[PDB]
Amino acid sequence: PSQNALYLDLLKKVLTNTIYWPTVAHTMIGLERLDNLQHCVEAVLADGVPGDFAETGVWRGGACIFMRAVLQAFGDTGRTVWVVDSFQGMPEAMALHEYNDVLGVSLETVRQNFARYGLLDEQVRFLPGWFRDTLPTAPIQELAVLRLDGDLYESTMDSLRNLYPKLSPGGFVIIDDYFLPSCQDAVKGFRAELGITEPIHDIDGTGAYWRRS
Amino acid sequence: PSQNALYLDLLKKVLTNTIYWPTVAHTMIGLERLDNLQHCVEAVLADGVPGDFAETGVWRGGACIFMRAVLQAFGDTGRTVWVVDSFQGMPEAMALHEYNDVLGVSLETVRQNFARYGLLDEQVRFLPGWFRDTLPTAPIQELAVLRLDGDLYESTMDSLRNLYPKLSPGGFVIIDDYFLPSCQDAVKGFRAELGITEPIHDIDGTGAYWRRS
Ligand SMILES: Nc1ncnc2c1ncn2[C@@H]1O[C@H](CSCC[C@H](N)C(=O)O)[C@@H](O)[C@H]1O
Ligand SMILES: Nc1ncnc2c1ncn2[C@@H]1O[C@H](CSCC[C@H](N)C(=O)O)[C@@H](O)[C@H]1O
Ligand SMILES: [Mg+2]
Ligand SMILES: [Mg+2]
Known part of the structure; x- marks a missing residue:
């Protein structure tokens, strides 16, 4: 219906640490991209799109926590949230990211x-x-x-x-960093091979997304 | 009915800072006393007890934020939350509390x-x-x-x-610190004068409360 709006609104503030690299926040993606994530998850639930949710690249887990929380807000107990990462940070330019492997957050x-959010259960x-x-x-x-x-391109x-x-x-x-060259080149390179033409919608001048036909 | 439980459960974790003197948390009273506060506010709302809510001694405001949030969870737009404090900490033993006036938190x-919780409105x-x-x-x-x-006794x-x-x-x-001598002496001294006999219920070996007839 559009359930538990107060919960989810508070959660976005909490995960970005607007209440108290982010330093302590559980996601780095900000409120605009968390709003996009909510719009997508909610649409899939209302439309009846089957399947699980997955994030490739989770850092402290915040975005994945949020997807799990949306399922909780809507009482959907069937779908799974896949939390997919190295849990050691970036692999070994390209842009020299492993330098900063306090992008490395253990499982x-x-x-x-x-577990801090009471969401470490069978659906994760x-x-x-x-x-x-x-x-x-x-x-x-x-x-x-x-x-x-x-x-990274490869990721x-x-x-x-x-x-x-x-x-x-x-x-x-x-695509959380569509405007990053590397990420962008993969997306266009991948789209060109398989002849994917569904249009890319901007989120916030950083992230972008599209919906499959 | 018992509305927005997820919201309120998350809020308690947030206000006590279990997600990330407390150092940064907006209340010092802990989860057990916030649960008591929720039980009382919810009972008053379901029973039809008229009136506003008031806290005398708010520090960073957390307990008052919570009462305002319960009203929000229940859609009660008529009641007011009075946030009553010096906003300069403790006055000038008794237990020498003004020493620690980083109990002093400005209005x-x-x-x-x-405002961090989106609750700075007409009902506060x-x-x-x-x-x-x-x-x-x-x-x-x-x-x-x-x-x-x-x-303090005087407070x-x-x-x-x-x-x-x-x-x-x-x-x-x-009574958040009923077992503090000073606070306790006032409560018993006040109860004895007016002949109040409603029984005192423990909360957690620190706080206590009673319900008027
Ligand atoms: N090839 C790869 N294999 C496994 N993990 C990868 C990877 N490339 C990047 N990563 C992971 O991708 C993450 C990038 S940071 C993503 C975090 C952001 N807060 C969010 O809320 O999603 C890191 O956690 C890193 O370990
Ligand atoms: N006589 C008095 N007049 C005005 N404020 C008083 C007072 N005696 C104590 N205070 C206030 O009482 C508070 C005690 S701390 C109460 C804070 C607790 N976190 C809570 O969630 O309620 C302080 O903020 C202090 O300024
Ligand atoms: Mg990103
Ligand atoms: Mg107290």
Whole structure:
């Protein structure tokens, strides 16, 4: 219907730490991109799009916590949230990201973070490893929402190549850093190969998304 | 009915800062006493007890934010939350409390705190001053809930003497530090004068409360 709006509004403030790199916040994506995530998850639920949710690149887990919280707000107990990451930060330019591997947040730490919100339950599953190792054989069957938040070309490509085919029609692909060259080049390069023409919608001049036909 | 439970459960975690003297948390009273506050406010709303809510001794405002949030969760737009404090900390043993006047939190700071939760609106009113100055002529007409969280004898007495008479029947008096001698002596001394016999219920070995007949 549009349930538990107060809960979800407070949660966005909390996950971005507007109440008290973010320093302590559980997501780095900000309120505008969390609003996009809510719009997509809510649309999939109201439209009946089948499948799980997945984020490739979770850091402290905030965005994934949020998707799990939307399911909780709507009483959907069937869908799963896949929390997919190395849990060691970025792999070894490209833009030299491993330097800053306090993008490295352990599985233990992410698990604890979910538990802080009372959301560490059967509807959350973790897939630890480098995407190139883990996604070709991922135990994911179908997705209604696919969120990409690995910055690198390779991370973005490996996620799209392996998980886009599992995305249901009417499902969403969310590209958190579409305007990052590297991420952008993968998305266009991937779209060109498979002849994907669904239009890309801007979110906030950083992230972008599209909906499958 | 029992509305917005997820919201209120998250709020308690947030106000006590279990997500990320408390250091940054907006209340020092802990989850057990916030649960008591919710039980009392909810009972008053379901029973039809008329009146506003008031806390004498607010620090960073957390408990008052919570009462305002319960009204929000239940859609009650008529009741007011009175936020009553010096906004300069404790007055000048008794237990030498003014030493620690980083119990001193300005009105500006408390106002900002409410706004962080999106709850700084027409249903919240501030009464700045020493209780001995402000309560004898308080613009409060009736109360359904009266929360005392000034530690001192004088603070507790001044609050009871001036506000208890405005407490509706079936309304609650909450004593946050009943087991503090000073606070306790005022409560018993006040109860003995007016012949109040409604029994005191423990909350958590620290706070206590009773319900008016
Ligand atoms: N090839 C790869 N394999 C596994 N994890 C990867 C990866 N490339 C990037 N990552 C992960 O991607 C994440 C980027 S940060 C994404 C975090 C953001 N707060 C959010 O709310 O999503 C890091 O956690 C990093 O470990
Ligand atoms: N006589 C008095 N007049 C006005 N304020 C008083 C007072 N005696 C104590 N106070 C106030 O009482 C508060 C005690 S701390 C209460 C805070 C607690 N977190 C809560 O959530 O309620 C302080 O903010 C202090 O300024
Ligand atoms: Mg990103
Ligand atoms: Mg107290």
